[PDB]
Design a protein around this ligand. Structure first.
Ligand SMILES: Nc1ncnc2c1ncn2[C@@H]1O[C@H](COP(=O)(O)OP(=O)(O)O)[C@@H](O)[C@H]1O
Ligand SMILES: Nc1ncnc2c1ncn2[C@@H]1O[C@H](COP(=O)(O)OP(=O)(O)O)[C@@H](O)[C@H]1O
Ligand SMILES: Nc1ncnc2c1ncn2[C@@H]1O[C@H](COP(=O)(O)OP(=O)(O)O)[C@@H](O)[C@H]1O
Ligand SMILES: Nc1ncnc2c1ncn2[C@@H]1O[C@H](COP(=O)(O)OP(=O)(O)O)[C@@H](O)[C@H]1O
Ligand SMILES: Nc1ncnc2c1ncn2[C@@H]1O[C@H](COP(=O)(O)OP(=O)(O)O)[C@@H](O)[C@H]1O
Ligand SMILES: [Mg+2]
Ligand SMILES: [Mg+2]
Ligand SMILES: [Mg+2]
Ligand SMILES: [Mg+2]
Ligand SMILES: [Mg+2]
Lengths: 370, 370, 370, 370, 370
């Protein structure tokens, strides 16, 4: 059975091809103690990975080895893959082909190191790197559509028509979930809440996932939040302190549609999706308008599909049918699509075998993987 | 039952002799993917023919194997004939004689390859190549008249009197529907509309067939279009964008009467028809003036019969009766005339049999076919 | 003295007729602040034009009012002309006739607005719009030749024989310098370099002008770049960071010859030039082969004249003499040719006077200007 | 004449706009007796403010109403402003507009209460709240530069380019002078010196301001202090006892560059300044490197400008010119810049008038003040 | 077998590692005769240590060599260690490694002299100095918790999470048992009881240990003691005189929670514990609230655990579970934890050997001991 490992900037989702859900989902973090150990005879490790790092984060410095879809610390990235194979899935990676994922328009050295580490460190028999948005279209059972995938590091749009990708129409924004977490940390200082440490950034991320939503009309929502407390929500911190937030609930996700909130010059996710459709041939735009697929954890805000539909309807001609497909399990669409792809019989010759790697080096990944 | 296949530059019209209409009408196009397929397990063909190429044209490069009535790509021409026999008519061509059509003054190697491919690739029992304008006179139930046939590639005039053709009076213009489509693409840039791809040329062809017409007086029509918006028409593109055109509606078909719009030195279709009549003997010109038959898709513009009558009346003596016969089904006159010819009992000895081809080679077509 | 203003998509070149070089050359950009001003009493303007926008681009959003040779923002286009007349040339435009330039096959409303703004906003006494490629032939001292002009927005070919243009043989590609800048930005992500803002696009344009070149044989050059670092060059960014590029140096200009690198279906500049020659009469093709003139900033790549000569030699018959004329000042050939034309005594009746505009409206430009 | 009041966490600096130095500088403290008064007929007040609290601190409990730039005791903050207006400046605040200062990224309720108290308690005619680091750039006579302001409560960096602030690049550390005073109190216990009361914290602050300095190389300085007594300095306590300190002189300011000395996870002031520059557009970083301005009392350590230059030079590219501007009066740069701003004629419409406050409430400060 | 010696300000607790209780517990006192000896031939020593000094205190001046956890008389401290080794434990210290204890935030010269005296005076083979509160967490079998240790000289709080100490959150009060003994001596003068000598201070300490308790509500207890004699207790002095005390029973321990009773400005032990928890990361505070461990003789007052729980519950958020762990043998928790630590196999490399001391001097203790 093939292994499907979806390494996003924030989460590692791993499991077996053929299953309908990942067997292991844990934060893609490595934590190291920032204090001195005074207790002799206690099992204190040098570093912690995943859920252990998250539960001990009070005395750790948390580090993400992946930033904006790009591995910035390959030693910590090996710790996460080792944790994935031996502690989470409890398999020997030298017996299973591994399907990995990547965002488009990434540095070429990123997937070359992924290939080298899989074959030389873990000794995988076969290996493949797929594009994340392409896998989301597999999960939706479609061959035509434009996928807007947004996770913790990258937001990218890939239009596909009749199984053919339009690479010149692929767009990528380095604005995603981690930028929204940092923006929420900033605007929480307006109410006197101070979150600064890496452990406190994990608390703000949990606040964002529980209380934030996308407003259908931002200016009308700002006027509603300024006239009453009907939008205020409370949240209990780990130490029992209760914080209350109002318009920050929808101002944080609003940066997806107005990146100028972050000082960015780029277009919002609605204009990025529309611009990607407009870079495609005129004869396929109607089918892309009707098959706009949302994917990733940053698309899980309540109200984001209705807002995307409203914004793209305003940009597109009035005779086009704008249909935003936001399945309830779209947080795992990339993994589910990879599980489908790695199980296809027509895919079993697409693997990069160990023999091909031995006779071509890590640059084989550029010839065999899109 | 004999098969009647009318291969024009733009459309393939096929059916059975004895019927009154073609059973299969599809564009004479072969489309090939110009992007990379990223969807595994999907039925993606290497090339698409006819209506499938037209519906998938957003990701294809469309190619016409016939240009100006001459086959320029014999491998793609076999794909179209194979699509015609096995997918459209769903017959075995080795059981039916096939009647093919051709424009006059074509290269001799064109109909020799048609003969070789019919007998050696499709194994037809019998075969024949007829002149397209002669078949149009069969469809009109006449034995005297001059036929002006204009399709997508060729415009040609053939005068016939009492069943005798006057070959020295046959004229041919390489100006037809595809040149008008390219001219409309050019003059649409004046309003800021940019059509460049082969798929967008199919959109402009559809605009031409729906909105273009022939003005009775061109200069008066240009003054009318410049003083009001009564001639403006709108058209919705496949992606919902609406374009508006004014004098381009009649400037595009005007190139048929003023080929200098295209930079050509040749005479218009009205002067070509008149010059063909004047090359005939004086005693038959009166009957040709009264039996001017229009044929082909490029004669389907509204107002072209009234314009042809007005222009030829100005060229001919005032005592001649100019009568332009433009039947409503003249887009299929060549096929209908071929269906009539292939059903005649006096035609059953005109076929080129397999035995005659085996003992004479493909050059037999020059002895048995006019 | 007449003013000669060459408004390309990227640069504005202005000066006086009779001079041999433009007196003012500045980017055709308008920049607006995208942050909030916190310094009271400082001379902060609402918008910046030209060189001021380029030096302050760190806090501006840069906008080109001309895209693909077509003015898309007429309010910003007036700012550039006002900057040209009053700040760069320091003249009163109501005392000088103005010669403007335009690409062929442009929307008719583009040169009508140019005429209206020159006469009603700047009150010019006379005015004229010339075709850019025709002016390049004036600068080369020829009356016969085909000019391939390629700037920041448009690539167009105009064949001229004995002073007569062949308008049906004029070709135009919407592929030029700005598309190459955007393509270089895309392929720089392969090495991990991220350029996204409008200010960073100006940095990539400077990288392109300093390090990019045209390979004589692309596939051989790709093999050379893959076997050693002899083609690698370094470039220091404004903040001191040094980037290194290898095969991107010649892959970016290669899109001129292989537009499929950009997802375009069009032919390269070599095939466009050859197709334009083949649309001309057979008797003039030999003189066009020997007088192929390159013009514009996008023809300034090292090695492009040798590549054009090699590619057209492969397309043309072997007995033709292919001669590519690439003068060292061909970046200013359009302006130099306009300076020559506006100084001719036989041109002084070709001007559109204020009286003719008052009695005919802006549509006078279609009667008096080619 | 406008009043300029710079309320830092530690000191209150007040004076008149147009002057070059504050007229009143006193500690921002309120002291209350912690013993029982036994002397009848003596003028014993209920609380003491400023210099009186500092001279009677032996029998008082000293309280700072501002902690980390945030007012935590608004009743004591009114005592300090009342002391400022009526006892120090000896003016009637209802006759003068008041310019106040604040650190960036403060709670919004902090400047709303400042506005309400100024208009309702002191009845000021006009009022304004400026950012402290922006005022320091006024004092240096610059419109471009990054200001690192560090007082008793807050360290913050504000980059400004051509008079435009980059708010997304503003960084703030809750590590400043009071944290260094508490750290010195802690490491003085290593030599047996015990300072615990609020009055003794004022003694340690005086030790810090007289004997502490920033080492150019910390590890080399630690080795020098461990091999001889050349770095030892003595200090006489108020009761005549003499203490001697060695490496504590530079270990206390070292916490600015290594906040892990305090158990903090944050970056040092050198990395905070560098990270703020790196959040800015690439085109402005060179000017920020050359115009790094130090401001506040915590930047008054001997050797801090040379250490900042050495640390930022190691972080920045080697071709950048790192220039640390540390003027000798940088302890009053915020006040001096406020005196300059409040005197500008272009600032006289930036005031928040009493009429605007009456029709908008204290929330007017968010619309009119950055 | 290792020796475990817990030298507090008041008591010396010594024994063997591996045992569950100290073998020798005696007062850390040295007594010297203050009268003239008139009896010849009687065994009169020059000084008395421990229990002998306590039984002869009528004719001695008693001196504590340790004050507030700091050795103030190193000659008398050697007498106590000599008494410990040779008279109480009856061992040769040159054959056993010795584990010593110390309060945190002590002068560095204190543990350096402990190291020098152990290696040079007693010739111990190995030696170690542990923090007292850390040893109390060993005795409770925990790796997470905040220990409030209070003996005769020092009260200190050390928070520990997963075996990691948070040194920046360690707090220390110089308010402990000896300050309460002196305060009881002072308030006993209100009833006419005069205790002044060092021998009489030992009597008051015995009164405190037998009759004093912590009131749950101090003001309610003061009203109960003022309305009846139900709280009065009697105590017989060594000479048969009987004293009676009422509210002094709970006013003396109340100084632990209200240090202003002693003229101190510091916070009570409940606020010190809470402030130490609040200096820790937010993610560990919940576990510290549930694992507050009391240690030392000053925590042996009846009712102190219920009072600590009530006071910390009022300070902490209402959703936190406040659990005060007060084991019945918490007077020996430091020694019991040292006996556990010195017996661990993972501790046998933590010893400071004689070789390490010979090559590094007494400053070795700062590198090897926390
Ligand atoms: N319910 C939710 N609402 C908003 N954001 C969410 C939600 N769930 C997850 N996220 C965000 O999605 C990001 C990661 O999404 P995901 O695509 O699952 O992982 P990765 O980015 O690692 O591929 C995180 O930044 C997280 O904050
Ligand atoms: N209604 C119409 N008006 C104008 N042109 C038409 C119309 N219908 C078809 N055409 C043109 O006729 C050309 C093809 O005509 P036809 O004779 O049917 O096919 P072929 O040229 O292949 O024999 C095409 O170029 C098409 O644009
Ligand atoms: N030396 C060079 N090499 C390559 N490209 C260049 C060079 N100089 C200018 N260009 C490109 O030429 C384009 C503009 O050329 P030009 O014709 O001078 O202006 P315009 O297009 O505005 O008429 C720009 O996109 C620029 O990047
Ligand atoms: N010469 C000095 N050396 C070191 N620190 C100083 C010096 N002078 C003042 N400070 C520190 O600066 C802090 C206050 O600085 P300042 O900016 O003037 O006031 P505020 O923080 O109230 O705005 C105090 O903590 C003080 O200890
Ligand atoms: N039952 C008790 N109640 C109150 N206080 C006590 C009790 N027992 C001992 N103490 C006090 O504890 C202090 C010493 O405690 P301990 O921690 O055992 O010794 P050391 O302080 O020397 O480490 C003495 O001041 C003593 O008065
Ligand atoms: Mg993802
Ligand atoms: Mg036809
Ligand atoms: Mg140009
Ligand atoms: Mg300050
Ligand atoms: Mg103790």
């Amino acid at each position: 059975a093939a292994l499907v490992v979806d390494n996003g900037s924030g989460m590692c989702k791993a499991g077996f091809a053929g299953d309908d859900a990942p067997r292991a989902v844990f934060p893609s973090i490595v934590g190291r103690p920032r204090h001195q150990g005074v207790m002799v005879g206690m099992g204190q490790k040098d570093s912690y990975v995943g859920d252990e790092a998250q539960s001990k984060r009070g005395i750790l410095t948390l580090k993400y080895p992946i930033e904006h879809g790009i591995v910035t610390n390959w030693d910590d990235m090996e710790k996460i893959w080792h944790h994935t194979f031996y502690n989470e899935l409890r398999v020997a990676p030298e017996e299973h082909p591994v399907l990995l994922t990547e965002a488009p328009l990434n540095p070429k050295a990123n997937r070359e190191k992924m290939t080298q580490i899989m074959f030389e460190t873990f000794n995988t028999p076969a290996m493949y790197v797929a594009i994340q948005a392409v896998l989301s279209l597999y999960a939706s059972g479609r061959t035509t559509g434009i996928v807007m995938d947004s996770g913790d590091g990258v937001t990218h749009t890939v239009p596909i028509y009749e199984g053919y990708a339009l690479p010149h129409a692929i767009l990528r924004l380095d604005l995603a979930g981690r930028d929204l977490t940092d923006y929420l940390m900033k605007i929480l200082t307006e109410r006197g809440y101070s979150f600064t440490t890496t452990a406190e950034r994990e608390i703000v991320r949990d606040i964002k996932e529980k209380l934030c939503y996308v407003a259908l009309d931002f200016e009308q929502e700002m006027a509603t939040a300024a006239s009453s407390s009907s939008l205020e929500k409370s949240y209990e911190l780990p130490d029992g302190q209760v914080i209350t937030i109002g318009n920050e609930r929808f101002r944080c996700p609003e940066a997806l549609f107005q990146p100028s909130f972050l000082g960015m010059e780029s277009a919002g996710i609605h204009e990025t999706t529309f611009n990607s459709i407009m870079k495609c041939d005129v004869d396929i735009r109607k089918d892309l308008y009707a098959n706009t697929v949302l994917s990733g954890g940053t698309t899980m805000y309540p109200g984001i599909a209705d807002r995307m539909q409203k914004e793209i309807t305003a940009l597109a001609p009035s005779t086009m049918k704008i249909k935003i497909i936001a399945p309830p399990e779209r947080k795992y669409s990339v993994w589910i699509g990879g599980s489908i792809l790695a199980s296809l019989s027509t895919f079993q010759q697409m693997w990069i075998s160990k023999q091909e790697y031995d006779e071509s080096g890590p640059s084989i990944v550029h010839r065999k993987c899109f």
